[PDB]
Amino acid sequence: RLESLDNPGQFYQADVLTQGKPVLLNVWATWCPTSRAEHQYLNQLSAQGIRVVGMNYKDDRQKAISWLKELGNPYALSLFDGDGMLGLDLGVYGAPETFLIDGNGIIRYRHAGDLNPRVWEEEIKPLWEKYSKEAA
């Protein structure tokens, strides 16, 4: 149910999402200027070793692929939710959004709006350390 963006008809097993460990899920869209605004910080954070899954939201694959090409692809797993069904059961209602999901696939935090140093180093990191540790 986790459709690949770079490869249309490829699906991943739920396990692949977290692989028994915390992960960040970022909802983004080429039609959302705020997604562009938070992307570089996202590249960096993913550069620091934080695992982040990408979920292209009700967007155009060609544009989406092109987008990550010119701006960078900070996702270890890049997903496509054109119909917006996946976002619907995660409770996604717009972009940008960033979710913290623990090693067990449970949503531990949802943030609507741009992801930045402030939000991470003040709302997510502590929860990230907790669940990263809680994944002994």
Partner: protein, 118 residues
């Protein structure tokens, strides 16, 4: 903890018809706006006059450019020349929040009361 409210609260849609005259309305929460270019109105089993969208204000997105938007409230009259029984009007629109949030497009289906052509 979210500062961005549900789509239907930021853009509260309503309509009122009186025979050939239909008025589409959106109450737009302060700090949010609709994109004039994303409004689409499609009749089903009805014939309407070309809809003129009103003059809105302007918004700029660093890399995307300038777009004509609507704030506070949007009033859109539509003329129903004819509508058969069970006719509908598909109304699609899209908006965002100034603080930085974009809602996906939303579609509402308006049941039109029957109107015989004049």
């Amino acid at each position: 903890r979210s500062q961005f409210v549900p789509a239907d609260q930021a853009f509260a849609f309503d309509f009122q018809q009186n025979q050939h005259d239909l008025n589409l309305t959106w109450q737009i929460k302060d700090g949010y706006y609709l994109y004039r270019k994303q409004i689409r109105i499609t009749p089903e089993h009805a014939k309407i006059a070309d809809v003129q969208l009103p003059q809105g204000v302007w918004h700029e997105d660093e890399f995307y450019g300038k777009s004509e938007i609507y704030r506070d409230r949007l009033t859109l009259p539509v003329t129903i020349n004819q509508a058969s029984a069970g006719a509908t009007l598909t109304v699609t629109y899209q908006g965002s929040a100034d603080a930085g949030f974009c809602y996906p497009p939303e579609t509402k289906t308006v049941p039109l009361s029957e109107v015989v052509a004049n």
